[PDB]
Design an enzyme around this catalytic site. Structure first.
Site, PDB file in Angstrom:
ATOM      1  N   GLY A 174       0.787  -1.218   0.000  1.00  7.69           N
ATOM      2  CA  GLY A 174       0.000   0.000   0.000  1.00  7.69           C
ATOM      3  C   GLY A 174       0.822   1.272   0.000  1.00  7.69           C
ATOM      4  N   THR A 175       2.098   1.160  -0.350  1.00  7.68           N
ATOM      5  CA  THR A 175       2.971   2.323  -0.365  1.00  7.68           C
ATOM      6  C   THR A 175       2.636   3.223  -1.550  1.00  7.68           C
ATOM      7  OG1 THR A 175       4.670   0.895   0.581  1.00  7.68           O
ATOM      8  CG2 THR A 175       5.337   3.057  -0.169  1.00  7.68           C
TER       9      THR A 175
END
Lengths: 197, 197, 232, 216, 214, 127, 233, 247, 180, 145
Positions: free
Chosen positions: E42-43
């Protein structure tokens, strides 16, 4: 989306020593509204058998057409017209062919047998059938069977009984029609007449 | 609620089961066999949903017999256990409502006696003793407490009786009788039933 | 007798298959090609059928790469060569996807030969009329293979095929060394190709490709001309 | 239409009246068919036997079955009982009778009770969970003596010397358990069956060497 | 040979453990147990189109390789992203080997879109695709259900709001490379940092394609 | 659009060791929404191409394509061995692409295989 | 002419390919089968013996089930396929009917399988013929024969393979009710029948004996030599 | 005659399969293979055909293959068909192991392959495999074993056999030089060397013309190894010295 | 159902791998110095192990060389991604030494095959995050095999018996431990 | 049996003969249903039964066509048997003399001796099922012919 619709009706059958009587009302309805006041539910199959069905109308039409096609097939293959018992067995097989998605139709078959006597068969939407002497079907069967049970006869007295039974049942039912049709099966053929209600 | 118990010894595998049928609509007698004969020196036991255990046992037995007839010698107990484990795993995924619990016991001339255990998800393990049914955990605990790797053939049946009566004095009445069989280097024998007043 | 020379799936009374021999004869009637395995590389050389000024140099090539470390040349029919090249590239990519490492030469040769074998056992088809030479470099060790129309492959050290290949083979036998280098191998390949050549060789009518630890590379026409001038 | 006939795989594209992704193709074949037999796929009032009691036990001289029709005469030498859905029982037992007749014609020898019960169980087991409901007791006599089996729609198939299913199953079963005896005369067996069916709250059959008879 | 086999088997995905898992998960939740879960990423990721190239940025590598002139970034389920990227890279290498020249961005975009639409959005992989070809620099934005979208700058990830605000505030068409790098770095930091620069000056479109190393 | 696709309980009145572990109720409905779609991808793609080609050009084109497919798919190995499908792939256009059917569950290395004569008879339609 | 296709009739109504297929049976080793009252005996003669071979892997007598046996004469590779199919069918019949298989039933299955391969030009028939013995469920001994064309019919004692006419004539002359009185008499009758063609008994003969409610039993050279000596006495 | 040779599905007027006969005749051109069974091991010796000066040696062996942890095989005939058959054998062994969690017996593996070989002689339109096989292995039911297969689909177990070129002379010499129940591995190796020397009339034997494989059981494990040129040279030298001492 | 826990860490020319005892086998050997560890549902563990053995045996027979850990995890990931819809309930862990350069290697995967390669330790099971901190605290670069043994034993004990496998260049030692 | 199951009655001899003849028609088209046979059948059949129209006799031919015959003979000596039948058959005759005449013709045409073991006989009568003669009945009817 419900693929089933209930339509009113009422059928009857009386078996005699040398005659058979099948009668029905002539109304098509959807509970509240009235579709038509003239729609007989008795169909002539051969010269010695009559079928009467009530319930969902589209299923009734499809069943009658399939029955007629099968009758023609049998006549072509076996070079003779098929009898009442064979029709009953074939109809039972046809009905059970759709056990998991049934026809919503109640049938009554009346006619003469090989020996020349009356025969009446009653079915269920799955295919179980048996031979009887008199049978009542349709919506008002529950409130009509005890009257017949508490009340073989000759042709004239049976007709008198049929007339009084329908005139009594029509006034107390919301699906009975404005006319009554009676089909008489005898050795000289088949004749029918309509009685106003 | 059915019962399954098995104890392994130095050169023998004592196996017991009940003989009560899951009857709910038909009145019968509590004379039913839960043990199937795969070969001369192999026994297989099934409990679970009625109408599936018998078919599974019949399928496995037919396959084992076909292997024997085709090859001229018999399947080893370990090979039979792995074969039935693969078959059970295959059958589990094709029928979602499905519950059968197995217990395989057999004897071999090279590797000696063996006892196998299975769960309803087809996981196979080899254990000195095993159980299935209602008081499975309690029976396992008491067997673990009172077990010895050098047990005798009698002490085994005495321990079986002790476990059954200790379950009686705590949980429920076990009116159904028990059938006891023992597998040795000679074959499959039959012992007298275990019953309570 | 000619009674067994027409159908592919029929054994001669002597236990021979004749259509496969005829496919081999078709292979032995194409343009020459030479492969030599040196101590630290492999060289492939061949003729080209164009030999004209109207040909476009960027259109079609005979030496083609399969992977970063595999290339091949053929002798026989070209349409049958293209489909096999495409299948080989697809197989190499599949192997890399599954195992996350480049395919060894031996596995690729085995799979290509297995594909070619299928067409020699069923009625209604004909065998491939082409033969292949595959070069590679794995674990710091060069390889050289040849695949027949029958589906049989051999591992070679120096070979020739095509028109007039027996004389090429005996020439290579006379002047092959086990401790050669890449430049010496290139010179020997050019000489053994010139042995069967008829016209004047230039840089526009031969193809040369090499394979060392860096990868598989196809030599440019300028480099081929420079090499040709070296030996005069 | 000769090129399309060579391809032995009739696709809707090759047929007439095709346009777009569909067309006048599903509205072409609307006939009533020629010949086949097959149950329809899954998507009213269904007659079911509720207030019926049956009874059956076997002894030295044959098998006696009684009930309160409710007994199907499969063969001159085979007998059956219905419980649950009447239509399912009738249909599947008709199929069983046809299979038995085929076996007898092929092998010139009458089928056994065990084989018939296994055939019925195999036929009814294929539709487990679909909605079928039936419970049958099968009586007969073969080369191994009298036989008695119980088959239902759940795959159960068991054999015993005494069975009872119905509303008054418990009372009648207790009565005929108290009064049972393998070495029993025909008259005492008749009396026991009559007393049990009376206490359950009358038909009566008796299977012998050479076919069943009706007592009352 | 098995006595229950009639037809040869095929390949692809297998749906054997569907119903079993469906009931097992319900039972385990009812009795309150835990089962293994799927790894997720989810970066935040970003990208911008400067004068003559593409700049892609990510936070901690995470920038996938599709071709010498095409690169991609992924967010969602890690396994799906890896598999889709590898398949597209292999197909594009085959295409380049056959055609003899470097591929185009639109080809990769079309392949990815058709794949994701084929699998009905059950393969969760949101991607940021960028590259440069003979026509010029291009940048796309693909979504798990198979819908693409062409923009001059995109952002994905948990902290994409601040990055989008920064891009809206300080974007200018046809800027210099250093300005684009600084803008991408600032936008990523507003939510270490990895940057990928694909420039037209480091690519030759007039030479035959040769296989690179990996 | 190639991946989007658009009363058969016979009674024997026309070996149980061979077939087993199957009920009609479970196979009435699919287990996953993607099961039938994935099992019938190639058939749906061929149907779509035939439909568009027939609507645009005429009857001759799909007939010629089907004739070529049938002719080229008759020179394969017997069903108990694995084939290569070279010319069929060339005609179909799948000679330069790799899908998920190629890298997952290699059919050339399957874990089950039946008797030879049984498969040859089943393919011919006898069984 | 008319003898090159399986489905072509001769002008006089002959199917020559099936007759040619049957001609291959007449070259195999002789097989003899005799039915007794409480025993069934099968006997096969060894065509030749190689000292450097294992006799276990070259046997021509096989067991199809607990109560059915089989002996063939013809093409060895073709016999194995039929034997395996018959074994599978025997095991599958019990899964549908609890009773064990019957000799007539299994003979019918084998005959139908053989007939299925004489209906098309794309496959050739099986060049074997078989003798099937066993016991029924109620305990009645049986003996049947099958042909490549797909016909079967019962017997009391029969011989197939090469040199079968002489053996059949000998059995016709020497078969009677007082010769099958006991198991020893039946075994000696089978040995005497086989001795008419075998150049030297004991070394070129193998017997399989099956009794009622018992499995197949293969006699060993010691027992065969003992019976040969008793006959020679 | 020449009328019944067209295909495999035609019976001669006396019931003969000429196509299968010709396929079996095709085996007589390949190299010679040997197999000898001893009390404590089994042996497999083959003749090298690829002997050109420009060939390479990259593979583990030329004709010996490994199918399983307990078996090995040798081929003679067409290399293209031999490769397919070897791959199928490996797949069959792995399938049985996955099914039963036990290694497959040798006779079962041989029968499974022979069924496939026989299937091509019955359905028209195909061509039978022109390959013969020799199998060796160890099994918990019967111990050391040695089998042989031919293109017809037939097989049988032997104690000493030979296939390929000049097979008849080798079989004739084995039938008189093999003594049952008293063979050790060294005696088997000496006999194999002598038989190969007699049946190869090309020239004197050299260590680069033959390859020998040995299967033995050592501490609950089966070990398969290929003898090296040093051992082969020692064996040939010892045999030559014995022959010289004989005269 | 408890799931268990499988742990692996590397030292200096040696690796270790441990599991939980008390009951089904969780560690299988895939080579001379290659091991795998599976945690999760028992039936899926057994099925995965058997299929992996099938594939590995076929590969080694076909190519004639010892497999390497990287290729092994690639094969495992390819096997696991087959069931992307309705997957196996396992979390494999791979630890071993290179067959040529003898270099340590450890790895971890999820239930659908997403590999992770580290240089100190990997942890799998239902309580990974609980003992991850203590594993981080107790680790030290470049320990001899003995110190590796005590460190891994303490990590498993302070997070019921355990089994420890120590893999070196020459010998492989297996021990069973219990806390009193 | 299918007809009985569906219609709860018994077929006629003509219907059974037609149903059988529908199967012998199809041949030569292997591209149709895989179970179709590529060559004509090589067997001729005679059907005999009793139904609503009285006793019936039918004949079916490998060509797939059937007719009704008052007296038919098939086999090796068909022409001679038919010639002898034509000189003896008359409508007003009884079953006993039909049996006697058929036995006499069989004795005349066979190449062996008629000894009540190399022949078999069967009859069907109105009210009695299909019946096959036993050894004693065959000997009794074969005496004095």
């Amino acid at each position: 989306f419900s693929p089933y619709v209930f339509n009113g009706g009422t059928i009857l059958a009386i078996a005699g020593e040398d005659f058979a009587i099948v009668a029905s009302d002539t109304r098509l309805s959807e509970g509240f509204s009235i579709h038509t006041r003239d729609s007989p539910k008795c169909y002539k199959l051969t010269d010695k058998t009559v079928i009467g069905c009530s319930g969902f109308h589209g299923d009734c039409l499809t069943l009658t057409k399939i029955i007629e096609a099968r009758l023609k097939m049998y006549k072509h293959s076996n070079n003779k017209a098929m009898t009442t018992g064979a029709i009953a067995a074939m109809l039972s097989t046809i009905l059970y062919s759709r056990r998991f998605f049934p026809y919503y139709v109640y049938n009554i078959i009346g006619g003469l047998d090989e020996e020349g006597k009356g025969a009446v068969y009653s079915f269920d939407p799955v295919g179980s059938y048996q031979r009887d002497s008199f049978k009542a079907g349709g919506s008002a069967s529950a409130m009509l069977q005890p009257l017949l049970d508490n009340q073989p006869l000759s042709l004239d007295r049976a007709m008198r009984l049929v007339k009084d039974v329908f005139i009594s049942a029509a006034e107390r039912d919301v699906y009975t029609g404005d006319a009554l049709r009676i089909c008489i099966v005898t050795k000289e053929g088949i004749r029918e007449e309509t009685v106003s209600l | 609620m059915e019962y399954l118990i098995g104890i392994q010894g130095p050169d023998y595998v004592l196996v017991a089961s009940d003989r009560v049928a899951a009857s709910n609509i038909v009145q019968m007698k509590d004379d039913h066999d839960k043990m199937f004969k795969m070969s001369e020196k192999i026994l297989l036991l099934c409990v679970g949903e009625a109408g599936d255990t018998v078919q599974f046992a019949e399928y496995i037995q037919k396959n084992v017999q076909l292997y024997k007839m085709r090859n001229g010698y018999e399947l080893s107990p370990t090979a039979a256990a792995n074969f039935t484990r693969r078959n059970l795993a295959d059958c589990l995924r094709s029928r979602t409502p499905y519950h059968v619990n197995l217990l395989l016991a057999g004897y071999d001339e090279h590797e000696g006696p063996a006892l196998y255990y299975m769960d309803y998800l087809a996981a196979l393990a080899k254990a000195p003793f095993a159980a299935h049914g209602y008081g499975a955990f309690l029976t396992l605990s008491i067997l673990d407490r009172y077990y010895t790797p050098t047990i005798s053939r009698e002490r085994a049946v005495e321990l079986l009786r002790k476990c059954l009566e200790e379950l009686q004095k705590r949980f429920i009445l076990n009116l159904p009788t028990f059938s006891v069989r023992i597998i040795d280097k000679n074959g499959i024998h039959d012992l007298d039933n275990i019953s309570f007043p | 007798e000619r009674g067994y020379s027409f159908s592919l799936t029929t054994f001669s009374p002597s236990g021979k298959l004749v259509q496969i021999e005829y496919a081999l004869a078709a292979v032995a009637g194409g343009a020459p090609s030479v492969g030599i395995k040196a101590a630290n590389g492999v060289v492939l050389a061949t003729e080209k059928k164009q030999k004209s000024i109207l040909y476009d140099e960027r259109s079609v090539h005979k030496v083609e790469p399969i992977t970063k470390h595999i290339g091949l040349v053929y002798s026989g029919m070209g349409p049958d060569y293209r489909v096999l090249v495409h299948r080989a590239r697809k197989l190499a990519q599949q192997y890399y996807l599954v195992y996350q490492e480049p395919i060894p030469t031996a596995q690729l040769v085995q799979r290509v030969a297995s594909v070619m074998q299928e067409y020699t056992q069923s009625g209604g088809v004909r065998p491939f009329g082409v033969s292949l030479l595959i070069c590679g470099w794995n674990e710091g060790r060069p390889y050289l293979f040849q695949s027949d129309p029958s589906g049989a492959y051999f591992a070679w050290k120096a070979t020739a095929m095509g028109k007039n290949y027996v004389n090429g083979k005996t020439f290579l036998e006379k002047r092959y060394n086990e401790d050669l280098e890449l430049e010496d191998a290139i010179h020997t390949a050019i000489l053994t190709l010139k042995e069967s050549f008829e016209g004047q060789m230039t840089e526009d009518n031969i193809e040369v490709g090499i394979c060392n630890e860096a990868g598989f590379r196809r030599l440019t026409p300028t480099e081929v001309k420079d090499y040709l001038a070296a030996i005069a | 239409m000769a090129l399309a006939s060579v391809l032995e795989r009739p696709l809707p594209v090759n047929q007439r009246g095709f346009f777009g992704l569909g067309g006048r193709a599903d509205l072409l074949d609307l006939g009533p068919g020629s010949l086949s037999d097959g149950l329809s796929l899954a998507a009213p009032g269904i007659e079911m036997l509720h207030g019926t009691t049956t009874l059956a036990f076997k002894f030295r001289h044959g098998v006696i079955v009684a009930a309160d029709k409710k007994v199907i005469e499969i063969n001159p030498y085979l007998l059956g009982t219905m419980a649950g859905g009447a239509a399912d029982c009738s249909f599947w037992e008709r199929l069983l009778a046809r299979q038995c007749r085929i076996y007898e014609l092929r092998n010139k020898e009458r089928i056994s009770v065990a084989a018939a019960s296994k055939l019925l169980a195999n036929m009814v087991y294929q539709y487990k969970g679909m909605g079928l409901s039936m419970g049958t007791m099968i009586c007969g006599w073969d080369k191994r003596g009298p036989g008695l089996y119980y088959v239902d729609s759940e795959g159960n198939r068991i054999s015993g010397a005494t069975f009872s299913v119905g509303s008054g199953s418990v009372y009648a079963y207790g009565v005929m358990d108290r009064g049972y005896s393998y070495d029993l005369e025909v008259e005492q067996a008749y009396d026991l069956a009559r007393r049990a069916i009376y206490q359950a709250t009358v038909n009566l059959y008796h299977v012998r060497e050479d076919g069943w008879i009706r007592v009352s | 040979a098995a006595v229950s086999v009639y037809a040869p088997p095929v390949g692809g995905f297998s749906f054997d453990n569907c119903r079993r898992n469906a009931v097992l998960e319900a039972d385990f939740a009812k009795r309150g147990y835990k089962l293994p879960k799927v790894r997720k990423t989810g970066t935040t990721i970003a990208g911008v189109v400067y004068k003559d190239g593409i700049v892609l940025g990510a936070d901690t590598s995470k920038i996938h390789f599709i071709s010498p002139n095409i690169y991609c970034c992924g967010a969602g389920t890690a396994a799906d992203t890896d598999m889709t990227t590898q398949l597209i890279s292999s197909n594009l290498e085959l295409h380049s080997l056959s055609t003899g020249r470097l591929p185009r961005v639109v080809t990769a975009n079309r392949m990815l879109k058709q794949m994701l639409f084929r699998y009905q959005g059950y393969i969760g992989a949101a991607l940021v695709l960028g590259g440069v070809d003979v026509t010029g620099p291009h940048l796309y934005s693909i979504y798990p259900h198979g819908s693409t979208d062409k923009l001059p700058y995109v952002t994905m990830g948990s902290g994409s709001l601040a990055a989008m605000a920064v891009f809206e505030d300080k974007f200018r068409p046809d800027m210099e490379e250093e300005e684009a790098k600084n803008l991408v770095s600032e936008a990523i930091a507003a939510g270490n940092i990895d940057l990928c620069v694909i420039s037209k000056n480091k690519l030759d479109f007039l030479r035959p394609y040769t296989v690179p190393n990996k | 659009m190639n991946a989007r696709g658009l009363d058969s309980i016979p009674v024997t009145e026309l070996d149980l060791l061979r077939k087993g572990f199957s009920c009609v109720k479970n196979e009435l409905l699919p287990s996953h929404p993607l099961e039938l779609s994935e099992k019938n991808f190639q058939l749906n793609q061929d149907k779509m191409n035939f439909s568009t080609l027939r609507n645009i050009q005429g009857l001759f084109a799909p007939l010629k394509l089907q004739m070529e497919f049938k002719a080229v798919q008759q020179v394969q190995r017997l069903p108990f061995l694995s084939s290569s499908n070279l010319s069929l792939d060339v005609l179909r256009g799948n000679d330069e692409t790799i899908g998920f059917e190629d890298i997952l569950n290699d059919p050339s290395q399957s874990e089950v295989m039946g008797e030879p004569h049984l498969m040859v008879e089943y393919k011919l339609g006898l069984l | 002419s008319y003898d090159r296709a399986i489905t072509v009739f001769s002008p006089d109504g002959h199917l020559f390919q099936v007759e040619y297929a049957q001609e291959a049976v007449k070259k195999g080793s002789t097989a003899v089968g005799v039915r007794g009252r409480d025993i069934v005996v099968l006997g096969v003669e060894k065509k030749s013996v190689a000292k450097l071979q294992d006799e276990r892997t070259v046997r021509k007598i096989c067991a199809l089930d607990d109560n059915v046996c089989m002996a063939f004469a013809g093409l060895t590779a073709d016999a194995r396929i039929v034997i395996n199919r018959a074994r599978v069918e025997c095991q599958s019949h019990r899964l549908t009917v609890e009773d064990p298989v019957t000799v007539e039933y299994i003979t019918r299955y084998i005959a139908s399988l053989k007939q299925r391969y004489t209906q098309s030009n794309g496959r050739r028939p099986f060049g074997i013929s078989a003798l099937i013995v066993g016991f029924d469920f109620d305990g009645t001994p049986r003996l049947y024969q099958t042909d490549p064309s797909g016909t079967y019919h019962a017997w009391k004692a029969n011989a197939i393979g090469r040199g079968a006419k002489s053996v059949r004539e000998f059995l016709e002359k020497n078969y009677t009710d007082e010769a099958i009185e006991t198991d020893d008499l039946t075994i000696k009758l089978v040995i005497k029948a086989l001795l008419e063609v075998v150049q030297s008994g004991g070394k070129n003969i193998e017997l399989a004996v099956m009794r009622r409610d018992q499995s197949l039993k293969i006699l060993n050279p010691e027992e065969i030599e003992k019976y040969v000596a008793e006959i020679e006495k | 005659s020449r009328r019944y040779d067209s295909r495999t599905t035609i019976f001669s007027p006396e019931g003969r399969l000429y196509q299968v006969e010709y396929a079996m005749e095709a085996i007589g051109h390949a190299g010679t293979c040997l197999g000898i069974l001893a009390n404590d091991g089994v042996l497999l010796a083959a003749e090298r055909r690829n002997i050109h000066k420009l060939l390479d040696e990259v593979f583990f062996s030329e004709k010996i293959y490994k199918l399983n942890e307990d078996m090995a095989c040798s081929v003679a005939g067409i290399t293209s068909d031999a490769n397919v058959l070897t791959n199928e054998l490996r797949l069959i062994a792995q399938r049985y192991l996955l099914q039963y969690q036990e290694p497959i017996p040798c006779e079962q593996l041989v029968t499974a392959l022979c069924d496939i070989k026989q299937a091509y002689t019955q359905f028209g339109g195909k061509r039978p495999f022109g390959v013969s096989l020799l199998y060796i292995g160890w099994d918990k039911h019967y111990g050391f074993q040695l089998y042989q297969s031919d293109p017809s689909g037939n097989y049988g177990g032997w104690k000493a056999t030979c296939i390929g070129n000049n097979s008849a002379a080798a079989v004739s010499m084995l039938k008189q030089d093999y003594k049952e129940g008293e063979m050790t591995l060294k005696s088997a190796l000496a006999l194999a060397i002598k038989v190969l020397n007699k049946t190869m009339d090309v020239s004197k034997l050299s260590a680069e013309k033959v390859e020998i494989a040995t299967l033995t059981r050592e501490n609950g494990k089966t070990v398969i190894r290929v003898l090296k040129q040093k051992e082969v040279e020692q064996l040939i030298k010892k045999h030559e010295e014995e022959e010289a001492k004989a005269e | 159902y408890n799931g268990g826990a499988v742990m692996a860490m590397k030292g200096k020319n040696c690796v270790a791998i441990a599991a939980d005892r008390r009951d089904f086998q969780k560690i299988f050997p895939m080579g001379d110095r290659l091991y795998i560890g599976l945690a999760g549902l028992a039936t899926d563990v057994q099925t995965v192990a058997q299929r992996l053995k099938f594939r590995l045996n076929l590969y080694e027979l076909k190519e004639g060389r010892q497999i390497k850990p990287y290729t092994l995890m690639s094969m495992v990931a390819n096997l696991l991604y087959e069931k992307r819809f309705g997957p196996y309930y396992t979390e494999p862990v791979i630890a071993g030494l290179d067959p040529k350069t003898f270099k340590p290697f450890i790895c971890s995967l999820d239930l659908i095959g997403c590999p992770m390669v580290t240089d100190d330790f990997v942890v799998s099971g239902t309580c990974a995050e609980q003992m991850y901190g203590m594993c981080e605290s107790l680790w030290e670069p470049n320990m001899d095999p003995d110190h590796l043994f005590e460190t891994i034993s303490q990590a498993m004990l302070n997070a019921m018996g355990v089994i420890v496998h120590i893999i070196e260049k020459d010998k492989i030692t297996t021990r069973t431990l219990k806390a009193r | 049996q299918n007809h009985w199951f569906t219609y709860n009655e018994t077929m006629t001899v003509e219907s059974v003969t037609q149903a059988v003849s529908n199967l012998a028609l199809q041949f030569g088209e292997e591209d149709a249903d895989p179970g179709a046979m590529s060559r004509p059948f090589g067997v001729a059949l005679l059907f005999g039964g009793v139904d609503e129209k009285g006793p019936q006799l039918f004949h079916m031919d490998p060509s797939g066509t059937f007719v009704q015959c008052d007296a038919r003979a098939i086999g090796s000596a068909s022409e001679g048997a038919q010639s002898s039948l034509q000189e003896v058959y008359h409508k007003s005759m009884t079953l006993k003399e039909a049996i006697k005449s058929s036995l006499i013709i069989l004795k005349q045409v066979m190449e062996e001796k008629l000894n009540a073991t190399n022949i078999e006989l069967a009859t069907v009568q109105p009210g009695q099922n299909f019946h096959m003669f036993t050894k004693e009945e065959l000997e009794e009817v074969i005496k004095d012919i």
